Write an enzyme that holds these catalytic residues in place. Structure first.
Site, short mmCIF file in Angstrom:
data_model
loop_
_atom_site.label_atom_id
_atom_site.label_comp_id
_atom_site.label_asym_id
_atom_site.label_seq_id
_atom_site.Cartn_x
_atom_site.Cartn_y
_atom_site.Cartn_z
N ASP A 120 3.49 -3.04 7.84
CA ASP A 120 3.91 -3.34 6.46
C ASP A 120 4.26 -4.81 6.26
O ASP A 120 3.86 -5.42 5.27
CB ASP A 120 5.13 -2.51 6.04
N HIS A 153 10.44 -3.85 1.97
CA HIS A 153 9.55 -4.68 1.15
C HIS A 153 10.30 -5.72 0.33
O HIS A 153 9.82 -6.84 0.14
CB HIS A 153 8.71 -3.79 0.22
N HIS A 183 -0.80 -1.99 2.62
CA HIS A 183 -1.61 -1.54 3.75
C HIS A 183 -2.99 -2.18 3.76
O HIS A 183 -3.45 -2.63 4.80
CB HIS A 183 -1.73 -0.02 3.74
N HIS A 226 4.64 0.92 12.32
CA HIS A 226 4.20 0.91 10.93
C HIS A 226 4.95 -0.15 10.13
O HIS A 226 4.36 -0.80 9.27
CB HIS A 226 4.36 2.27 10.25
#
Ligand SMILES: CC[C@H](C)[C@H](NC(=O)c1ccc(C#CC#Cc2ccc(N)cc2)cc1)C(=O)NO
Ligand SMILES: [Zn+2]
Length: 267
Positions: free
Chosen positions: A229, A252, A73, A225
Site C-alpha cells: 500500500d 493512507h 494497488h 500488504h
C-alpha cells in the site's frame, strides 16, 4: 532505469472492494514524459497527491467532480515495475480489487513492458524527514534504492510484525492480500466500506484464526500488504521514488501526509 510504458492496451475488470460495484480498467500506452494519469468521463486525473480526495481505508483520486476509489494497488504495481507513462481509463467508480493483491496486475503488465528512450526522473529523498500522528510515524531518508519497512501491531495472534521490501524483491509483496478483522466487519459495513469484500479477495482475520480456506500466504502477510500500500501511495509523488522508508502503524492518510511534505520540501 529508463522510462517505460505498455506494449499494447491492457484491460482489467471486476468488483471494487468498497463500492461492491463492477468496473473496468483500460491501460493505454503513452509517450515519454507523459506520466501516470487516470481518465474517467472525459476528465484526466493525474496520479499525483494534488488530486487525492479521500484517504479512509483507501486512497481515492478526484477532479472536476469525477472520483476514482482505491488507486493504491494498481499504482503500487506500476511503481514496482517502473511503468512511468500510461493512461488508466476507468469505467465505473473504483479500481477492481481482483484477487485482493497486486498479482493479476503485476503478471499481465510485466509481460507487456515497453522500454522508452528517456531516463527516469526519480523522486529522490534528499534529507531525513518524519511525519507523526499519535503513535503512528513514517520517516524517510536518502537511499539509492527503494526500501520500505512497515511495522504493525495487531490485537490478535499476529502480534507485532514487520516486513522490509528491498528493490528486486517485489514477488515478496505483490501477492499479499488486503485484509480485515472479523471484529471490524460490522463497522466497515455500517459506514458502507467493504461492500465487495469476500474470502475470494480479502484476508479475513480473527483472534486466533484466519477465515480464508487457504489461510495466510505468509505469516506476516498483513504487514507485507501494508508495504505494498505505501509503495502505491508513494507513487503519488509523480515519478518512481528513491529513498528508505519506515512506517510504524501508518495508514493512507499518514502516507499521503508524508508525500505532501516531501513534495513541499523539494520545492
Ligand atoms: C488500510 C489498509 C487496508 C488493509 C485496506 N483494506 C481495507 O480497508 C479493507 C476493509 C474491509 C475489507 C472487507 C471485507 C469483507 C468481507 C466478508 C468476507 C467473507 C464473508 N463470509 C463475509 C464478509 C477489505 C479491505 C487496504 O488494503 N488499503 O489499500
Ligand atoms: Zn491495500
Amino acid at each position: 532505469g529508463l522510462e517505460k510504458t505498455v506494449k499494447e492496451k491492457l484491460s482489467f475488470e471486476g468488483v471494487g472492494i468498497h463500492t461492491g460495484e463492477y468496473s473496468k480498467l483500460i491501460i493505454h500506452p503513452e509517450k515519454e514524459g507523459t506520466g501516470i494519469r487516470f481518465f474517467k468521463n472525459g476528465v484526466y486525473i493525474p496520479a499525483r497527491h494534488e488530486f487525492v480526495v479521500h484517504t479512509n481505508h483507501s486512497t481515492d483520486l478526484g477532479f472536476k467532480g469525477q472520483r476514482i476509489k482505491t488507486v493504491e494497488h494498481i499504482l503500487s504495481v506500476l511503481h514496482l515495475l517502473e511503468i512511468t507513462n500510461v493512461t488508466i481509463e476507468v469505467i465505473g467508480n473504483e479500481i477492481p480489487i481482483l484477487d485482493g493483491s497486486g498479482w493479476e496486475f503485476y503478471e499481465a503488465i510485466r509481460k507487456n513492458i515497453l522500454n522508452q528512450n528517456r531516463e527516469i526522473d526519480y523522486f529522490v529523498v534528499e534529507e531525513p524527514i518524519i511525519v507523526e500522528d499519535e503513535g503512528r510515524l513514517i520517516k524517510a531518508e536518502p537511499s539509492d534504492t527503494l526500501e520500505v519497512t512497515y511495522e504493525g501491531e495487531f490485537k490478535n495472534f499476529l502480534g507485532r510484525q514487520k516486513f522490509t521490501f528491498v528493490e528486486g524483491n517485489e514477488e515478496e509483496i505483490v501477492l499479499a492480500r488486503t485484509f480485515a478483522f472479523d471484529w471490524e466487519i460490522e463497522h466497515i459495513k455500517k459506514v458502507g466500506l467493504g461492500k465487495g469484500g469476500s474470502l475470494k479477495n480479502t484476508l479475513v482475520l480473527g483472534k486466533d484464526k484466519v477465515y480464508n480456506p487457504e489461510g495466510l500466504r505468509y505469516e506476516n502477510e498483513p504487514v507485507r500488504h501494508k508495504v505494498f500500500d505505501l509503495i502505491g501511495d508513494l507513487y503519488l509523488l509523480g515519478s518512481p521514488v528513491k529513498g528508505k522508508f519506515y512506517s510504524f502503524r501508518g495508514g493512507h492518510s499518514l502516507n499521503v501526509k508524508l508525500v505532501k511534505e516531501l513534495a513541499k520540501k523539494q520545492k
